[PDB]
């Protein structure tokens, strides 16, 4: 009755989504083969797995997801592992030739022959669903197919469906730690498409996640599997109000009507707590008053942005576990008292709080330690204007002397489209400055 | 999907090609009889990139052996792993190029290349989805340089959107064994810059330095030098055949390395390289590998990388390792040595991680770096050419086969033109 369809496009989305679908199976008690462990006995609460899975009629559960990519190696890993029996075989769409860090290839040359197959599958997925809340898309912007096919999908979905809310969990490049050499180009191009076609976008850069594992979890050599588990917990907490009863249930539709003051401003960054390992998480009581203090710690923000440089527009808090409503209210009063956190003038009240009864679920072989309480943050602040400013500066350095341009011009893209993307970010910067000033 | 076809020409290229297929076969567990005897299922998932299926289930490489003299092909077929090659893919001349670029490109090469174009056409149309071509040849010999570079133009004319890759061995002034080397080297560079998508340069002088100084082995031979090149050759396509954290094919390397269309010459290197008596004293860790990676003495090229500035650089890691350590290591070297990196491009090093190392090694790295120091080879080669061409020495052989002195002037001007535009970015400021 309340369903969400998750789209995984690009290698970044697949691997992040790979850890997500391991967590949801654990949280609902579904084996990787798809069958429920204990037959059909009368102990099952329906409309709990209906958010993410679909009943096959007799036995197993089929997840509501589609895997989209232009390169075979990442998809074939899933089709060969132990999760081969879970997904629908014709929902893992794969191509032949990769985009190879080129935006023009994934949006003008190869993306045109794959979008038809993807949209056809989405139609079948939505037809089975009856109370579709919205869509979830995962993609790293700093890549070819992630930005190319990602832009095309939002453009096609915005006209095919219309008013359905879409949430984008994108991964922007870190300030100075980055893999590719030309990703500032196709990141700017990708930004223009998702600005006018998404309702909520979440900042999920990689450098901030490295710092969290170094300080809190005390992990000095983390691989990508460690990071993807952290994002997986955030998705679980956000959606936990759609399938578990609580004191203050908050749906998907009542997120982007409370975090979006103006239609253009929908870029916000997330935070999670407590994130602490099983060898020192067992000295502390982890009170609600102190876990909510760690949420506003600027070092715990999962985006490389300093919130102290900008005002807070609105914040969203989602507690799960055994929190008490008064204890939350007492903590919020202390936060407003603190002088280091300042809100915007025209937003007197700025907290939206939800409480759920189901505690977080720990994955065996993981790094986190399972606890009673957890809080997830989705905060919109004016400090986010700096991440686009530094990306614009990097673009200006290389586009001044036309580096790497001939790769884009030769694949059908016109020379001028680099210019139009510039004013879009420039206009976006002006809006953030305009909003932040007081009356 | 995205398979590649291999072509080797000349005596130098054939020896390079012969050793390369020995490395690949052992990596995928292929016996000299063409039967698979590997251990892990990963050894067979991506075998279609280099191999074809035939009746009986045996595998044959899709390699074309092309030359003017049957003497060299009789030796390579007689070597171990020589029975894998298709006996119908052996196409050879009967006269010989005689180290004459005119002979290999106008008189004897032209009349023979018709036949070899059919077999390479057959191999290209048979594949599911072509990725690109790779060529191994030398720029000092006639058949390698002349008929080697003509095949590139014909193939590029028919397959424009593919990727052309060449592993080119240029001659060095120290170890020089052919007097007319400067002549046919200049004519090859002119033709190579127009069509080749990616080219890598190897120096026999540099390979000698690596063996004698680093490996500390007393008697290097041509089998040893061919072994070093072959290991680096498989590293480029290593991630195209095994799963990894950050998959990166040939096209991705092309996008991230070439800023301007005419600047596509690279120098390569391999790590780690440890002596037999000193391999129990080193510790294999990511900080250890990167220090040997950027070592000037480890380059397979005679150019000194500290005499210029790196435009772009790339490092391909093989083995199970943490991504953060790789990322923090690449940033540190770029900040500690900011003087040797060009400043109008941020984070000019690309990192890739693959989860399957070479056989016998827990960790290995292939380095492909675009640096402005390459201009030294072109300058010294041009210096040899201009002194020898002013007196018209050894010119009647080239002018005796329909090629006039106008073409020589065009090649010399083009080669100097490449250097001038290649050097101006070194002093370019933002």
């Amino acid at each position: 009755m309340r369903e969400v369809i998750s789209i995984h496009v690009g290698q970044g989305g697949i691997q992040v989504g790979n850890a997500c679908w391991e967590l949801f199976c654990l949280e609902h008690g579904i084996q990787p083969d798809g069958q429920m462990p204990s037959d059909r006995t009368i102990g099952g609460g329906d409309d709990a797995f209906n958010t993410f899975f679909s009943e096959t009629g007799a036995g197993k559960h089929v997840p509501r997801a589609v895997f989209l990519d232009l390169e075979p190696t990442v998809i074939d890993e899933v089709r060969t592992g132990t999760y081969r029996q879970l997904f629908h075989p014709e929902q893992l769409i794969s191509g032949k030739e990769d985009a190879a860090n080129n935006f023009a290839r994934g949006h003008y040359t190869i993306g045109k022959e794959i979008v038809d197959l993807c949209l056809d599958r989405i139609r079948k997925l939505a037809d089975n669903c009856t109370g579709l809340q919205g869509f979830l898309v995962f993609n790293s912007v700093g890549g070819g197919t992630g930005s190319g096919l990602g832009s095309l999908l939002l453009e096609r979905l915005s006209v095919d469906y219309g008013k359905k809310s879409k949430l984008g969990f994108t991964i922007y490049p870190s300030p100075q730690v980055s893999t590719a050499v030309v990703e500032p180009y196709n990141s700017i191009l990708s930004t223009h498409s998702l600005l006018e076609h998404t309702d909520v976008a979440v900042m999920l850069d990689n450098e901030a996640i490295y710092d969290i594992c170094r300080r809190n979890l005390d992990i000095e050599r983390p691989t990508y599997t460690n990071l993807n588990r952290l994002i997986a917990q955030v998705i679980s907490s956000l959606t936990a109000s759609l399938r578990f009863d609580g004191a203050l249930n908050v749906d998907i539709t009542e997120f982007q009507t409370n975090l979006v003051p103006y239609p253009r401003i929908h870029f916000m960054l997330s935070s999670y707590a407590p994130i602490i390992s099983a060898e020192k998480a067992y000295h502390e009581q982890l009170s609600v008053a102190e876990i909510t203090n760690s949420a506003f710690e600027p070092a715990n923000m999962m985006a490389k942005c300093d919130p102290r440089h900008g005002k807070y527009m609105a914040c969203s808090m989602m507690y799960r576990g055994d929190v008490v409503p008064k204890d939350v209210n007492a903590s919020i009063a202390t936060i407003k008292t603190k002088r280091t956190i300042q809100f915007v003038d025209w937003c007197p009240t700025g907290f939206k709080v939800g409480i759920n009864y189901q505690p977080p679920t720990v994955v065996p072989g993981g790094d986190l330690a399972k606890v009673m309480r957890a809080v997830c943050m989705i905060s919109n602040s004016t400090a986010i204007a700096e991440v686009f400013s530094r990306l614009d500066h990097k673009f200006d350095l290389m586009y001044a002397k036309r580096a790497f341009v001939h790769w884009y011009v030769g694949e059908g893209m016109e020379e001028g489209e680099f210019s139009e993307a510039r004013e879009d970010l420039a206009a976006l910067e002006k809006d953030y400055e305009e909003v932040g000033i007081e009356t | 999907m995205r398979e590649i076809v291999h072509i080797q020409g000349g005596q130098c290229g054939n020896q390079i090609g012969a050793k390369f297929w020995e490395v690949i076969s052992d990596e995928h567990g292929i016996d000299p009889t063409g039967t698979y005897h590997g251990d892990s299922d990963l050894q067979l998932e991506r075998i279609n990139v280099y191999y074809n299926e035939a009746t009986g289930g045996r595998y044959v490489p899709r390699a074309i052996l092309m030359d003017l003299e049957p003497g060299t092909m009789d030796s390579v077929r007689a070597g171990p792993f020589g029975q894998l090659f298709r006996p119908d893919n052996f196409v050879f001349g009967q006269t010989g190029a005689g180290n004459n670029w005119a002979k290999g490109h106008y008189t004897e090469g032209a009349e023979l290349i018709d036949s070899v174009l059919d077999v390479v056409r057959k191999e290209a149309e048979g594949c599911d989805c072509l990725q690109g071509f790779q060529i191994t040849h030398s720029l000092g010999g006639g058949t390698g340089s002349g008929m080697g570079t003509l095949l590139i133009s014909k193939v590029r004319e028919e397959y424009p959107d593919r990727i052309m890759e060449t592993f080119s061995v240029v001659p060095s002034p120290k170890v020089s064994d052919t007097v007319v080397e400067p002549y046919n080297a200049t004519l090859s560079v002119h033709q190579l810059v127009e069509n080749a998508d990616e080219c890598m340069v190897i120096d026999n002088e540099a390979l000698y330095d690596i063996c004698f100084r680093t490996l500390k082995l007393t008697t290097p031979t041509y089998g040893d030098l061919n072994h070093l090149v072959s290991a680096a050759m498989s590293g480029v396509t290593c991630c195209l055949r095994f799963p990894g954290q950050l998959n990166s094919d040939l096209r991705k390397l092309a996008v991230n390395l070439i800023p301007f269309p005419r600047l596509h010459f690279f120098m390569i290197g391999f790590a780690p390289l440890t002596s037999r008596g000193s391999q129990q004293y080193r510790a294999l860790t990511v900080p250890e590998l990167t220090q040997q990676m950027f070592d000037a003495k480890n380059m397979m090229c005679a150019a000194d990388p500290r005499h210029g500035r790196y435009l772009t650089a790339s490092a391909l890691f093989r083995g199970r390792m943490s991504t953060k350590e790789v990322d923090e290591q690449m940033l540190n070297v770029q900040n500690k040595n900011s003087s040797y990196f060009v400043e109008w491009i941020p984070n000019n090093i690309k990192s890739s991680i693959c989860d399957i190392p070479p056989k016998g090694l827990k960790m290995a790295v292939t380095f492909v770096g675009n640096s402005t120091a390459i201009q030294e080879m072109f300058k010294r080669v041009a210096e040899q050419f201009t002194a020898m061409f002013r007196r018209k020495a050894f010119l009647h052989w080239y002018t005796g086969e329909g090629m006039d002195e106008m073409e020589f002037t065009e090649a010399e001007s083009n080669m100097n033109d490449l250097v001038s535009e290649y050097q101006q970015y070194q002093d370019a400021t933002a």
Binding site: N18, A19, E22, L26, E27, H28, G29, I30, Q31, P32, P37, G45, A48, E77, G81, T82, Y83, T223, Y224, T225, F244, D245, Y357, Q358, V363, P364, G365 | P243, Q245, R320, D355
Partner: peptide
Amino acid sequence: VYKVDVSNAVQPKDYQNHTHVKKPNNE
């Protein structure tokens, strides 16, 4: 990395018993 990290991390266990939250006298 995927095979050793994600594919074989889970076992038949951890799925067996899964239960979540349900919906004077004197005188």
